[PDB]
Write an enzyme that holds these catalytic residues in place. Sequence first.
Site, mmCIF file in Angstrom:
data_model
loop_
_atom_site.group_PDB
_atom_site.id
_atom_site.type_symbol
_atom_site.label_atom_id
_atom_site.label_comp_id
_atom_site.label_asym_id
_atom_site.label_seq_id
_atom_site.Cartn_x
_atom_site.Cartn_y
_atom_site.Cartn_z
ATOM 1 N N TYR E 55 0.797 -1.230 0.000
ATOM 2 C CA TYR E 55 0.000 0.000 0.000
ATOM 3 C C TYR E 55 0.831 1.281 0.000
ATOM 4 O O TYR E 55 1.580 1.547 0.943
ATOM 5 C CB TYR E 55 -0.968 0.037 1.186
ATOM 6 C CG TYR E 55 -2.004 -1.071 1.220
ATOM 7 C CD1 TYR E 55 -2.265 -1.860 0.098
ATOM 8 C CD2 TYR E 55 -2.745 -1.309 2.375
ATOM 9 C CE1 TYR E 55 -3.242 -2.863 0.131
ATOM 10 C CE2 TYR E 55 -3.716 -2.301 2.420
ATOM 11 C CZ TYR E 55 -3.961 -3.078 1.299
ATOM 12 O OH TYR E 55 -4.913 -4.076 1.373
ATOM 13 N N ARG E 154 -7.108 -14.318 -0.470
ATOM 14 C CA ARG E 154 -7.331 -14.671 -1.865
ATOM 15 C C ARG E 154 -6.918 -16.116 -2.162
ATOM 16 O O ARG E 154 -6.605 -16.451 -3.299
ATOM 17 C CB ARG E 154 -6.572 -13.715 -2.794
ATOM 18 C CG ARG E 154 -6.851 -12.243 -2.544
ATOM 19 C CD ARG E 154 -6.103 -11.370 -3.547
ATOM 20 N NE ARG E 154 -6.139 -9.959 -3.181
ATOM 21 C CZ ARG E 154 -5.586 -8.985 -3.898
ATOM 22 N NH1 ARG E 154 -4.952 -9.269 -5.032
ATOM 23 N NH2 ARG E 154 -5.658 -7.728 -3.477
ATOM 24 N N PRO E 210 -16.355 -3.798 1.586
ATOM 25 C CA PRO E 210 -17.772 -3.948 1.942
ATOM 26 C C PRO E 210 -18.667 -3.138 1.000
ATOM 27 O O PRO E 210 -19.837 -3.460 0.790
ATOM 28 C CB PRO E 210 -17.818 -3.399 3.369
ATOM 29 C CG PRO E 210 -16.413 -3.635 3.858
ATOM 30 C CD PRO E 210 -15.636 -3.147 2.689
ATOM 31 N N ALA E 212 -17.590 -2.438 -2.125
ATOM 32 C CA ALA E 212 -17.061 -2.705 -3.456
ATOM 33 C C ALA E 212 -16.318 -1.467 -3.962
ATOM 34 O O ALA E 212 -16.527 -1.025 -5.094
ATOM 35 C CB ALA E 212 -18.201 -3.076 -4.415
ATOM 36 N N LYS E 219 -23.043 6.506 -5.002
ATOM 37 C CA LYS E 219 -22.598 7.787 -5.537
ATOM 38 C C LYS E 219 -22.223 7.792 -7.005
ATOM 39 O O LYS E 219 -21.935 8.848 -7.566
ATOM 40 C CB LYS E 219 -21.434 8.346 -4.720
ATOM 41 C CG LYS E 219 -20.156 7.548 -4.762
ATOM 42 C CD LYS E 219 -19.155 8.238 -3.857
ATOM 43 C CE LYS E 219 -17.871 7.475 -3.697
ATOM 44 N NZ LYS E 219 -17.014 8.177 -2.700
ATOM 45 N N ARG E 229 -12.902 7.705 -5.602
ATOM 46 C CA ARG E 229 -11.842 6.735 -5.826
ATOM 47 C C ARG E 229 -11.707 6.439 -7.312
ATOM 48 O O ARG E 229 -10.592 6.350 -7.831
ATOM 49 C CB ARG E 229 -12.098 5.437 -5.046
ATOM 50 C CG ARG E 229 -10.960 4.428 -5.210
ATOM 51 C CD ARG E 229 -11.149 3.138 -4.401
ATOM 52 N NE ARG E 229 -11.090 3.341 -2.959
ATOM 53 C CZ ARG E 229 -11.164 2.354 -2.066
ATOM 54 N NH1 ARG E 229 -11.300 1.099 -2.474
ATOM 55 N NH2 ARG E 229 -11.104 2.619 -0.766
ATOM 56 N N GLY E 288 -13.440 1.164 4.823
ATOM 57 C CA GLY E 288 -12.560 2.040 4.075
ATOM 58 C C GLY E 288 -13.236 3.404 4.109
ATOM 59 O O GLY E 288 -14.457 3.486 3.955
ATOM 60 N N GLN E 294 -17.879 9.820 6.259
ATOM 61 C CA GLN E 294 -18.031 8.454 5.780
ATOM 62 C C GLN E 294 -17.871 7.439 6.909
ATOM 63 O O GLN E 294 -18.728 6.575 7.105
ATOM 64 C CB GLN E 294 -17.001 8.160 4.684
ATOM 65 C CG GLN E 294 -17.343 8.745 3.327
ATOM 66 C CD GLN E 294 -16.241 8.541 2.306
ATOM 67 O OE1 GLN E 294 -15.396 7.652 2.447
ATOM 68 N NE2 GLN E 294 -16.262 9.346 1.249
#
Lengths: 91, 91, 91, 91, 326, 326, 326, 326
Positions: E55, E154, E210, E212, E219, E229, E288, E294
């Site tokens: 990250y 994953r 959560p 996506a 939005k 994003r 996130g 948010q």
Amino acid sequence: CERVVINISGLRFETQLKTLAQFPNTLLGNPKKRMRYFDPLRNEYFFDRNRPSFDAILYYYQSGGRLRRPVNVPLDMFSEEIKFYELGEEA
Amino acid sequence: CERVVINISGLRFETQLKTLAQFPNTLLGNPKKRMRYFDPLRNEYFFDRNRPSFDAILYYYQSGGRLRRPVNVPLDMFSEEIKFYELGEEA
Amino acid sequence: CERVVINISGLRFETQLKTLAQFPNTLLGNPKKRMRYFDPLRNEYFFDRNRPSFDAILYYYQSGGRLRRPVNVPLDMFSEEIKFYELGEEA
Amino acid sequence: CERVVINISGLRFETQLKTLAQFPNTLLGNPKKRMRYFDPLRNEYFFDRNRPSFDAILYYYQSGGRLRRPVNVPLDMFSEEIKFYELGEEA
Amino acid sequence: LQFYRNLGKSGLRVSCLGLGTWVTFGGQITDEMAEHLMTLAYDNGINLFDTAEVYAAGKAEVVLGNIIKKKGWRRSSLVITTKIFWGGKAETERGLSRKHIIEGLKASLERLQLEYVDVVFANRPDPNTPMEETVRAMTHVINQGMAMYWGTSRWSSMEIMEAYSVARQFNLIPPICEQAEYHMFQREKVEVQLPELFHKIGVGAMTWSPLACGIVSGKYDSGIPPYSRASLKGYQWLKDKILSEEGRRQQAKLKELQAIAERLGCTLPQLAIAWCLRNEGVSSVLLGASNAEQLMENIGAIQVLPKLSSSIVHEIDSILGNKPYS
Amino acid sequence: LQFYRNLGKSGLRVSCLGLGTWVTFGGQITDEMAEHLMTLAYDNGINLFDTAEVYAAGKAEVVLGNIIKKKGWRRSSLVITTKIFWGGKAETERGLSRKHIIEGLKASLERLQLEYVDVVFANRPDPNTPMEETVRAMTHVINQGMAMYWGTSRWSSMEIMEAYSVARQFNLIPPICEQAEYHMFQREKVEVQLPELFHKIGVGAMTWSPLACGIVSGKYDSGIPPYSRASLKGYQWLKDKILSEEGRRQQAKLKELQAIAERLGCTLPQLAIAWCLRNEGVSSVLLGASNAEQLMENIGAIQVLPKLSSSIVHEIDSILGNKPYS
Amino acid sequence: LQFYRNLGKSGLRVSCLGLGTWVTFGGQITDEMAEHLMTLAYDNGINLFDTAEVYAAGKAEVVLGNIIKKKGWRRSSLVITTKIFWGGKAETERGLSRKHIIEGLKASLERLQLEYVDVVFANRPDPNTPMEETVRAMTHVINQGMAMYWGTSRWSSMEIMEAYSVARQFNLIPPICEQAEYHMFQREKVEVQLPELFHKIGVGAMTWSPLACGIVSGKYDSGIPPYSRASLKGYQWLKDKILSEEGRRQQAKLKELQAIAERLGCTLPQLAIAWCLRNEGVSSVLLGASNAEQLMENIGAIQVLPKLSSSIVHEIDSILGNKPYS
Amino acid sequence: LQFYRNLGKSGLRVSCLGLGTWVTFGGQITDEMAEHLMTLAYDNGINLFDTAEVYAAGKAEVVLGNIIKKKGWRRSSLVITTKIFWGGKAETERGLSRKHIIEGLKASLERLQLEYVDVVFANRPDPNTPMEETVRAMTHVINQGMAMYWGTSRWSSMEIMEAYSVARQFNLIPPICEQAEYHMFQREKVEVQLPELFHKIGVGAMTWSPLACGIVSGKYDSGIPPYSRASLKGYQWLKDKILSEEGRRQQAKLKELQAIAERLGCTLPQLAIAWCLRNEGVSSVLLGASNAEQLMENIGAIQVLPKLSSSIVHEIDSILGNKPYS
Ligand SMILES: NC(=O)C1=CN([C@@H]2O[C@H](COP(=O)(O)OP(=O)(O)OC[C@H]3O[C@@H](n4cnc5c(N)ncnc54)[C@H](OP(=O)(O)O)[C@@H]3O)[C@@H](O)[C@H]2O)C=CC1
Ligand SMILES: NC(=O)C1=CN([C@@H]2O[C@H](COP(=O)(O)OP(=O)(O)OC[C@H]3O[C@@H](n4cnc5c(N)ncnc54)[C@H](OP(=O)(O)O)[C@@H]3O)[C@@H](O)[C@H]2O)C=CC1
Ligand SMILES: NC(=O)C1=CN([C@@H]2O[C@H](COP(=O)(O)OP(=O)(O)OC[C@H]3O[C@@H](n4cnc5c(N)ncnc54)[C@H](OP(=O)(O)O)[C@@H]3O)[C@@H](O)[C@H]2O)C=CC1
Ligand SMILES: NC(=O)C1=CN([C@@H]2O[C@H](COP(=O)(O)OP(=O)(O)OC[C@H]3O[C@@H](n4cnc5c(N)ncnc54)[C@H](OP(=O)(O)O)[C@@H]3O)[C@@H](O)[C@H]2O)C=CC1
């Protein structure tokens, strides 16, 4: 292929998962039916059952369906195991 | 002498490599034929096969070639194992 | 349920403690009688005894009291084991 | 009492040293005769020999001298084992 | 109903909601915003914080570490998790080899200014490294006190069981958690496959994205909003998904979900997140956020949970039309 | 075709070519040349560097360590290997005993100014130490973080399998690589024996002396050139081999190989090295160089690889007449 | 008869009497009194000192550590024990998870100014953590040299055997001791259950509250004395037990015991403590004291031991009427 | 014939003669003499030096450590051994419990100014500690790098086999050596029992008191010489043995041995020591000396070895009359 260990009163048997999957509706072949007997600590399924009989039970899967009663196993005892493991004969 | 471990459906047998080498063309005696069954994780060869029959299979090597069918093993089942392990009788 | 391991001359048997508790006065079913044979190093009870006979001994508990002499075990040898393990027949 | 582990072609037997010492001149009972077969890596004695026969061999010591041929072991094979382990009958 | 719960069958207790650092920390938002977000989360009971060596090329870890040290929170009150896989351009700076797991985690701990993380995850499967090697390496860093537990991310059910099998085989340490994507449009793995591993080998499920990536917030109804994003540089992939044919069908379904949200008196994001926690199979949900607005709205999802009746749930499956078959 | 590959079946990724330090580092060449050679190798993608406690009585390790620290390369981008066996005149300063493996490696790491090597090798078999002891010692230094993996060098297949067997027996760590000599005049072990161990227990092959100390370069055609390895002091053994009856027969065959090289548009050394990498059985080839001209020429061998057709290979076996029987 | 004895079947040798720190250290008494009490105990042969992370919110450990360092006693002459379970308000600061056992003990060692404790105990069972995890964590801190041995406290026989079983299963370290309450009014566990575990798996018994918090001293005959533990703030639970119907029946029986004490020429507390050591099943008894007068009187219990004839013991069982059935 | 040999079947190579520190170092002789003795031994090829926590209450270790650091010898050229059992007056400062093995060795290493010893020995059996505990503790300090190997001293064959059995049982580390008394008047254990353990489990024999504390030197022929070990304070036990009826019979036999010594052209002490090394069963013999004259004479024993013909040996057994029965 992924293998599975089956502990019968201390006697360990090992076979490939695909060998058991060859009969999806039997107890050992159905994930949901055998789940109850899984031991997370040793990564094996445990059955507090008759040892002499299991050789014939495993041979059933390995042979594609042959159900032979071991010479040293009484008739009544073997029938109880066939019932518990839910083995069929009808081909 | 170097030893070899053979796991037959959970039942482990151990013998000296030279014992198997005594018959270079059989499946267990030929490095190329048994290679496919080696398990690097446990340093043993694994066969998802009939357990009762293997005692006679191992005795074949230890005895120098004697092929005796175990009393508790049916005739047809034993012949299939002899064929798989590629054992000969002809001396 | 809590399990117990019984080592008979190297041959290990495993069963649930409740299976043995089903006969509280037998040697294996009485905590005080089997205590002497416990091995703290391996967490198992050890008996330097006859191996072939124990299958019938364990089956006695698993079957709820059936005492069948194994075909390969002589009559006199089996009676000595029944006596040592203190098994009763009377229902 | 100190225990000893005997590995017969992969099949492990365990007994008390005093059980074997009960016959000091036999192969397993004589420290000098069995020394050659000791495996320092696993703390056991290893014999690349017939498995079915050893139960009778061990029973010989545990029973104080009874030499019974197992039902499933041929007469000629059993005599060879008696000779190798140097067992006597004469009481 | 139970804010804190065990992560799978392990003894590690986590809050039902966690706060992640992908995209935001050391990237999209400022260190000031990051500190504010983490502070709000912590004061609201969240003890779980997730990050990864990849990250913002390590910067996310630096910022997280700075906040923790600046705030002075007791290390024992925090559950810090990081993922290892992508740690540099060199051939040996990626993967799950013993070399990179050790070098990767050591470097992350240095950036985080921490002696250890509570859970180190393999960010994805490594086709180039034997399972045994990976399991011996995770067990090693745990035994060296660089991590308390380890997990997977994953990985297929088959791969997880293999990790578990190898661990029992060599008496090492099995994984305790799988970090999997879970939201209204990605349901199969978490709902059908993971539960089986939970009951069988105790592996817990920690879910991510959560919303996506925000898509489920609603939005993007009329398009890609400025500063979203999907508008950020490097995220054209997200912009393409949203505007694609599939993306539009998703937005259409969200319009229907919006009606269910208004009916319950909550917002779409709160509905989406509460929906993720509706089943006990999920130990925690990683949030996130780029704004404090948010975050607090998202945490408000916990209140929505009791409204998700069996009728409401069935109603949501009817509009989604993607209920997985077990 | 694939520049980077796994070392055997382990997760460690190495470049198909590596750079060794025998004879040169801290000995024949200057630290300035050493730095230049390593820099060229690194910038050209080579991440593998080999050395040993015995080389130049430890000086080779000191010079390698100085370059790494001077250049400031990320440790995680380097795969450093060293060998242990000969570490002093005292009775206890040689061998593979637990005492020397630990003291030997610790001393090498100190000279290298490194916390750990990626692979520690036993430079040769030790008839005086039980295999169990050696395997427990290699596993120990790995668990202490002094090494990531361990391997063998100059060990027979039987000895390698034994190391592997003892490891599985006591649940320790098996070796992942055997460093073996391989070049046009030494082929049996690498071509016939090692492949079997690769497929069976995953042990990889890292080869050395690709040019047979320079012999395969063709520069000893007319005799021992001034300043050549064979001319250096302490290497009369190499001079005797080259001038011996066997040595001359080798030179005669090289003259034929030279014709194949010119035909392909490469030099003999490049042909010899490409030849070594022709089969996948070899994970990496350790180069040796005393000039930057040599190194770049040697690295140019990679381009020659695609020219080694099956006809060319068979042609080379015909002139060599030493193709091993499997 | 034998002042020092092994703790269970382990090799750790403890004095038959120990000194605990609950309520007093860093709480009820002053550091000056604490130092005086510990000094008297030590000079009188006591080498066992018990504490816990929860006592006085960590202060008990700080005071114990200060005294040890102030007095300069050799660490090797002391057997220090601490218990882990309650270490903070955060969700993750309690329990027997790997995370808290490690963080908890590390924090206690820091407060104690010690490199390790001789025995770390789980202060109580943890329903939220798998036994395997707990056993692997206790084994870990022991292998890290943070503790020499570990034990259990307030665990059932079944739970202790399980810890032992899991240890043998994964070749970890079994517990060596159970710290259980034992006094004239709480006898079953120590007299009937623990002996079986001693003979079977070697677990020893270290007992606490020999005077049932002082109740067996007889000072609550007429009521709650000023400055008594029952008078302290936070101990209304103890005051309620003493004044309750059950509490009064206990006091009535103590009046009868007082007559046996006077007959033997000792005090009630000395009788009660000697009574606790009458059977070999108990390795050590943890004393509690707020005055030096109390401590020396309590230690005087050792002299009373030889007077506890079989007739005296039977006499005490007759008045107590609570002899457990085995 | 072979000056250096393996210690038992381990990989540790020791000189056939070693130098101990009992009585002398930090006690009878001065640090100046100690340094001189150790220097002579070292320059003469001896790499083995033995000591113990109990010798001169730790001072022997301090002096040994000072010499090593003063001389600056490479640690890797030295084989240092120390014994643990008696380390203080406290109840917990003696024995083979995990607590004392760790605290004891750590303290010895501190006095020795060393990071580790090559071999740590249990100075004697511990009836109060379970074998498992002792074996897990020796394995622990080895894994912590405080020792390379461990051994036993004054243990019965049965006890040694048990240590070995427990080690294999729990996959720990078996002992590699037994330090046993061996001289012309104490022969049974070394000649009859130890060889069996060597061939069976590889345990080597390191012997002590080659001169039976000096008795076999012949200097007590006419009585207790001034400044002799038997004259030192604290050694009345040795004086009583020498003057006792048994002691006199020994001296009488030494007079006969003296004749064999003169016949061979050596001194009695050299004969006695060479005699100890006559059989391969002994890995090394620990010498003792208070003068440099003694040491060099003792080392001269190596030259006498080739003279010990089968006839000479049989001659010595005839006069001793104590040849053990196997
Ligand atoms: N293990 C793995 O492979 C992975 C794990 N993860 C973990 O989980 C997290 C990923 O979830 P993430 O993917 O960040 O996000 P979500 O799916 O939860 O979407 C959060 C994003 O949606 C927007 N948003 C959030 N709340 C609202 C709201 N209430 N109203 C409107 N918009 C809102 C923001 O977009 P904007 O910034 O545009 O405002 C924000 O960044 C990471 O932090 C990471 O820790 C992530 C990826 C992979
Ligand atoms: N594990 C083990 O037992 C061993 C491992 N090895 C490893 O592998 C390496 C050994 O290979 P090495 O033995 O050095 O060498 P090579 O067989 O590759 O020969 C290299 C030598 O040949 C000469 N040379 C190199 N390139 C050219 C060229 N292009 N044209 C002409 N001459 C050339 C140089 O000689 P000059 O200096 O004369 O110019 C140089 O030192 C070591 O660095 C070491 O790491 C080596 C030995 C044992
Ligand atoms: N593992 C676990 O779960 C637990 C372990 N423990 C351990 O054991 C100890 C607990 O025993 P504790 O519970 O303290 O006490 P006791 O049952 O031994 O009672 C001691 C108390 O009784 C009073 N007292 C002591 N001696 C006398 C005397 N001679 N005459 C009159 N009154 C006397 C004092 O009360 P006052 O202060 O009123 O004067 C003192 O604090 C702790 O120190 C701890 O280490 C304790 C609880 C739980
Ligand atoms: N593991 C265990 O339990 C034990 C191990 N040991 C080890 O072995 C050693 C013990 O052997 P030690 O017992 O010291 O001795 P020895 O049996 O070898 O006797 C040596 C003593 O004899 C005298 N002496 C030595 N050489 C001569 C000579 N050439 N002529 C005349 N007198 C001589 C000296 O006595 P003086 O000082 O009177 O001149 C000297 O101290 C210790 O250093 C220790 O390391 C010792 C005891 C127990």
